[PDB]
Design a protein around this ligand. Structure first.
Ligand SMILES: [Mg+2]
Ligand SMILES: [Mg+2]
Ligand SMILES: [Mg+2]
Ligand SMILES: [Mg+2]
Ligand SMILES: [Mg+2]
Ligand SMILES: [Mg+2]
Ligand SMILES: [Mg+2]
Ligand SMILES: [Mg+2]
Ligand SMILES: [Mg+2]
Ligand SMILES: [Mg+2]
Ligand SMILES: [Mg+2]
Ligand SMILES: [Zn+2]
Ligand SMILES: [Zn+2]
Lengths: 94, 131, 136, 386, 87, 150
RNA sequence: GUGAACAGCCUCUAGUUGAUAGAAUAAUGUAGAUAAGGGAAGUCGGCAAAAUAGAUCCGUAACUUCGGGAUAAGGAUUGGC
RNA sequence: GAAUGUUACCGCAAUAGUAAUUGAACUUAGUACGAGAGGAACAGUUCAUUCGGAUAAUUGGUUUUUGCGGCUGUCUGAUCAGGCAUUGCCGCGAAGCUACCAUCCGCUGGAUUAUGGCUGAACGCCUCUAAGUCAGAAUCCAUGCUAGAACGCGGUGAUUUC
RNA sequence: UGUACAACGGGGUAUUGUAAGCAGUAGAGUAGCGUUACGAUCUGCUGAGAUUAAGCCUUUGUUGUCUGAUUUGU
């Protein structure tokens, strides 16, 4: 109340709540915490060892890529023949 | 927007929710309490003859029997079969609290489900015997 | 903004004009409250005094104890079915209109409140917040 | 005899007559008082109203119930590309008021501002200012004499500027020309500033900045001929009243044997000049900023333009002013932004605005997504994508 | 309540107005003037870079057109007896 | 400030959008649109309405169980603010979203394989079943080619 | 054809396509609708509107000239296959 | 809306009108005052009542968008696609319009009244009054807001080749 | 005779709610000889299909259009 009275008084003084934070670094007190990123909430992704979790996800992704997860002719027909069949069927429908 | 839907689903004319009815039917104690109700002068039939599935009071036991022999009651009973669709289902569909949704689904499949089914069967045979 | 209310009140959409009937959410024996006046209401020709969430009204008990009936008592509105805007960014509403019986100092006659209580009313009245089990 | 129940009259008698405005550009009736000690500055600016959107603000207001809390507020976006200085006008004081003494124009004018002088541009030979431009030859005598006359005699100096309407999505090609008063040093300093700024552009951040209170001057949206009930707010007469219920039942019952000027009558609603004051600037956005719609809390790289663009307006590709609330006029209308006429003494004039989020969902419907990338991410793969 | 035109409220407003509000106004005006000068300098630099590729008595009449028009106007006013200041 | 998911259709609910309904048991129901709110008031089943994420997940139109879908959950135990942890989270969110989009694309491609075979069989059957129209087509093409030649 | 039905709605035979027209979509009207929350606080007065409605089953008070009251009241239901 | 050379742009302001209002809250403070019981205000801040002017980002209402879908009866042989039922009926419904059912905004200089004074005679006391003069009310006149004399005005651009 | 204008077309942005056609072993049962026939409905191709300026945004495409009449002088 003495600080408030010497600065602005009641209803004028704007106290900084971040001054009482017990952080690892005192330079982090006046840091703006992000909340939104591309339609997602940051707070429900925030977690320690998320680096390890993302590393495990990357290992799984590499395994899927190696296995081949992401990768015109029929029995008795050639590509030109099936193109002719498709073209004639489109003509018939029209 | 139209008058029929407006005057049926006004907020002051709202009915009890399906998940609440499922919670009522899941536990045997709740079913016993709803079957043995105190005499209330403000209720139809003095608070007796209460259909738990439809959450509806009848004036008489014959009215309750006719209600049980009907498609509206069958419609509600069919609606009360599966997962109750709480907010966790929509969160999981959006991709949020998926593990919590999976745990709830497996709990319903394992423990809550068959107990609710047995309670429903006992209620059905009790109503058939007494009516 | 009423005697016993803690601080100022920001404007809420009005849901309950004079003549409305709301449920009684306390355990004093009343079943419903019939609004006859709104405390702090303005003066305008032809305009009905109307209450909102957190407002103090004068109410008569229509259904309840015979000793409780046939008198006018102060009440506080704790639920309304008319949608109102919260400054955090959503419009919201309850199923019913409901209030609790209080004294002119804002103290509850009953000892507990059943059903949810609006944050505006609970923050405005300290005794409602003390007797509330569910706050939104 | 006397009226039994008192009631305030319907409508404001100071906004009479309720007629159509003379011009679509509303006149600035007063400028801030000039202080000769201050540096040279413009007193107003021109913009085009684009639309409205929504923000979330982290409020710092001691004594308020919403102190240290979030509030959702509506804002108006005004597209403000830089204006171009093309002239200067000197005003002397007379017992009959302010009188314009002389006007000096720049040597080169663009077709945008030349079109303001024509009713049929495509058929004209485009001869405007073609002989005036010849007075700049051989050291500019005449131009120098008129500038010296303004320095010697004028008590008020105004600068003639015009909008760069080609930068907006507007279908109109004709620019808007207006006088903006110069408040600053001496008359000679104002004249020197105007002369050195001929054919130069002034941007909106060299007139206003963030957290400043400004005034909006514009013509309201027209509504045509209107009855008394919605023109003045009178109560409707009971059902099936003879000769209509959307009327005043008795326009006169007393001695003067006339209809009083203070009685509500049917007529024109809207399209009036209006000056509203004390609108706080929430953002001064730069048009070359790739993320002028992003905040420190919201890391999404996006601009101010909503999905699908502003309805009936288009995209915002220039500097913009985001003020809170609403201003008179409709979308795509020219508006004048004026400096405050007095030193505001409210704490809201000293508050610093920090925005946490800016809404960029589509205004063409119930917009659910902020970006097309977000919409694609939510929906997934469509039939035509495969 | 005290009106908007109440003398004591206006006096207190003036006392407040002479302080922090006027100081903030002055600081904003200085910043805006600096930005305006920077904008003019940037336009000058862009014009110089563009040109790199390519490379007093006020007495009497204003002009002859003004002299002829004003003399004809005054002669017409004298002839038609429609002058504001001259019989 | 938080992005909520619609109770009916799981669409994102941004601040100042939609409407909330509070029940007697303190359950909040947020709806992104009046459409979803009115469907809920009419007591329709979102697992029966096809345009909802609940229906799509139940019917298998899009993948529902994956490693990239377990990174988002409500955090009821807060952690102390850490600048490097925040930066790592901000990069991880982008990486997770990119991987999830790739897997969703793969799931849809696996679901839609076989369509080319079905369309080819339908086209072949139509061509076999319409001989006379094919003769008309041949006559028209021959007349057009003769016109081009002369 | 639907339906208890010469009801209302649609159709076949037969007969009409007549009644000054065109362009725009201000106020006020004439005729017809919808509306959040509350529910007669409106008004001399619930004026006007709204609500009810067919059919099957259960059930139905005072009073009474014993014939009635009575469709009293109050409830459950209705599609398709 | 004719006319005073024509035509165009930017302005001035005679005159006329004029608008804001009330309550509560924090602090001052459980302080002055008071045996006690009780209990203020100025300065500094925050909301709300009534009124007024706008505005449609959001929420709500509205639907001939006859936009999408569905239902009854009949009719076009059936499917498909459709007609009619004086907008057939039911659900959603953009755009537009709109709501204290939604949101925003609404000021500051001179002169005064009652009254309190200063100097000071009348009247060798005295006296705010006689001459002179200081302050002082939601009052007055302005600032600010609306219109702009169609017979008030200024500055500026262009001014015809048969 | 051009960041020219228009009529279409394209891409976005929105509204609704999954088109027509084909197929299945899903379908209470019933009839004939495990099969076949009928069968409300269910499922897949299919957030499909339809509409989207008439006062939405945008546009390297296609096709065209650019013209008559009257009056005015210090
Ligand atoms: Mg009255
Ligand atoms: Mg209004
Ligand atoms: Mg919109
Ligand atoms: Mg209503
Ligand atoms: Mg009455
Ligand atoms: Mg009355
Ligand atoms: Mg009777
Ligand atoms: Mg004070
Ligand atoms: Mg039909
Ligand atoms: Mg004296
Ligand atoms: Mg005039
Ligand atoms: Zn039932
Ligand atoms: Zn939704």
């Amino acid at each position: 109340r003495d600080i408030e009275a010497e600065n602005g008084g009641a209803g004028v003084f704007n106290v900084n709540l971040k001054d009482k934070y017990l952080l690892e670094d005192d330079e982090w007190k006046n840091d703006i915490m992000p909340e939104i990123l591309d339609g997602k909430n940051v707070y429900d992704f925030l977690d320690p060892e998320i680096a390890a979790k993302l590393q495990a996800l990357e290992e799984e992704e590499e395994k899927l890529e190696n296995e081949g997860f992401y990768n015109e002719i029929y029995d008795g027909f050639e590509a030109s023949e099936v193109d002719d069949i498709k073209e004639k069927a489109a003509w018939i429908r029209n | 927007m139209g008058r029929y839907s407006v005057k049926r689903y006004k907020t002051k004319r709202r009915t009890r929710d399906l998940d609440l009815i499922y919670n009522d039917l899941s536990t045997k104690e709740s079913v016993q309490k709803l079957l043995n109700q105190p005499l209330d002068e403000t209720k139809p039939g003095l608070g007796q003859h209460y259909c738990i599935h439809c959450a509806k009071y009848m004036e008489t036991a014959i009215a309750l029997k006719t209600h049980l022999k009907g498609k509206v009651h069958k419609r509600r009973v069919k609606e009360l079969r599966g997962v109750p669709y709480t907010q966790e289902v929509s969160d999981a569909a959006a991709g949020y609290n998926l593990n919590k949704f999976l745990n709830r689904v497996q709990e319903i499949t394992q423990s809550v489900g068959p107990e609710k089914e047995s309670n429903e069967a006992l209620l059905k045979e009790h109503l058939d015997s007494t009516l | 903004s009423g005697n016993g209310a803690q601080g100022t009140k920001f404007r809420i959409s009005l849901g309950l004009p004079v003549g409305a009937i709301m449920n009684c959410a306390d355990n004093s024996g009343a079943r419903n409250l019939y609004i006859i006046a709104v405390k702090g209401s303005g003066s305008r020709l032809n305009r009905l005094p109307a209450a909102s969430l957190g407002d103090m009204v004068m109410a008569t008990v229509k259904k309840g104890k015979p000793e409780l009936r046939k008198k006018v008592m102060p009440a506080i509105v704790v639920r309304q079915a008319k949608s109102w805007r919260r400054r955090d960014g959503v419009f919201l509403y309850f199923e019913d209109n409901a209030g609790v019986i209080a004294n002119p100092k804002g103290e509850m006659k009953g000892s507990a409140i059943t059903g949810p209580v609006g944050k505006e009313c609970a923050d405005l009245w300290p005794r409602v917040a003390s007797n509330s089990g569910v706050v939104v | 005899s006397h009226r039994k129940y008192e009631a305030p009259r319907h409508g404001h008698l100071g906004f009479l007559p309720r007629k159509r405005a003379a011009s679509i550009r509303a006149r600035v009736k007063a400028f801030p008082k000039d202080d000769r000690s201050k540096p040279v500055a413009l007193t107003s600016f021109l913009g085009y109203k684009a639309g409205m959107t929504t923000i979330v603000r982290d409020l710092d207001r001691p004594g308020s119930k919403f102190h240290k809390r979030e509030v959702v507020e509506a804002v108006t976006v005004v597209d403000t590309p830089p204006v171009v200085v093309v002239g200067v006008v000197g005003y002397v004081e007379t017992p009959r008021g302010l009188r314009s003494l002389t006007t000096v124009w720049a040597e080169h004018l663009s077709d945008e501002v030349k079109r303001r002088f024509y009713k049929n541009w495509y058929k004209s030979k485009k001869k405007a200012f073609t002989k005036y431009s010849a007075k700049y030859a051989q050291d500019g005598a005449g131009i120098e004499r008129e500038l010296a006359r303004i320095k010697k005699y004028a008590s008020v100096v105004r600068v003639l500027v015009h909008t760069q309407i080609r930068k907006t999505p507007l279908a109109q090609k004709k620019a808007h020309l207006a006088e903006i008063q110069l408040n600053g040093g001496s008359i000679s300093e104002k004249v020197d500033w105007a002369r050195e700024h001929f054919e130069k552009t002034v941007a909106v951040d060299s007139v206003f900045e963030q957290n400043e209170m400004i005034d909006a001057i514009a013509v309201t949206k027209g509504h045509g001929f209107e009855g008394v009930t919605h023109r003045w707010g009178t109560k409707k007469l009971p059902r099936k009243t003879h000769r209509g219920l959307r009327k005043v039942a008795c326009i006169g019952a007393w001695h003067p044997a006339h209809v009083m000027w203070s009685v509500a009558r049917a007529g024109q609603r809207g399209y009036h000049s209006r000056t509203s004051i004390n609108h706080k600037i929430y953002r001064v956005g730069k048009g070359d900023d790739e993320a002028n719609g992003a905040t420190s809390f919201d890391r999404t790289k996006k601009t101010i333009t909503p999905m699908g663009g502003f309805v009936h307006y288009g995209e915002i590709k220039n500097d913009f002013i985001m003020v809170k609330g609403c201003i008179p006029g409709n979308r795509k209308r020219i508006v004048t932004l004026r400096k405050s006429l007095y030193t505001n003494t409210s704490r809201k004039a000293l508050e610093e605005v920090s925005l946490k989020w800016i809404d960029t969902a589509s205004k063409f419907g119930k917009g659910r997504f902020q970006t097309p990338a977000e919409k694609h991410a939510f929906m997934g793969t469509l039939k035509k994508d495969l | 309540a005290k009106s908007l035109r109440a003398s004591s409220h206006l006096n207190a407003k003036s006392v407040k107005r002479r302080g922090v509000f006027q100081k903030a106004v002055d600081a904003r005006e200085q910043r805006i003037s600096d930005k305006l000068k920077e904008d003019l300098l940037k336009q000058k630099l862009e014009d110089l870079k563009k040109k790199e590729e390519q490379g007093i008595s006020t007495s009497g009449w204003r002009d002859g057109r003004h002299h002829t028009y004003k003399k004809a106007k005054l002669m017409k006013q004298s002839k038609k007896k429609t002058s504001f200041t001259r019989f | 400030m938080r992005i909520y998911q619609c109770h009916f259709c799981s669409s994102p609910c941004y601040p100042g959008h939609g409407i909330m309904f509070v029940r007697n048991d303190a359950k909040e129901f947020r709806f992104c649109r009046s459409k979803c709110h009115k469907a809920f008031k009419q007591r329709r089943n979102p697992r029966k309405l096809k345009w909802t994420k609940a229906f799509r997940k139940a019917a298998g139109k899009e993948l529902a169980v994956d490693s990239t879908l377990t990174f988002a959950q409500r955090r009821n135990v807060p952690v102390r603010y850490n600048r490097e942890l925040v930066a790592t989270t901000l990069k991880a969110m982008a990486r997770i979203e990119e991987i999830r989009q790739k897997r969703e694309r793969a799931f849809y491609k696996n679901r839609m394989r076989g369509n080319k075979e079905k369309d080819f069989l339908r086209d072949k059957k139509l061509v076999e079943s319409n001989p006379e129209l094919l003769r008309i087509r041949e006559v028209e093409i021959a007349r057009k080619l003769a016109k081009e030649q002369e």
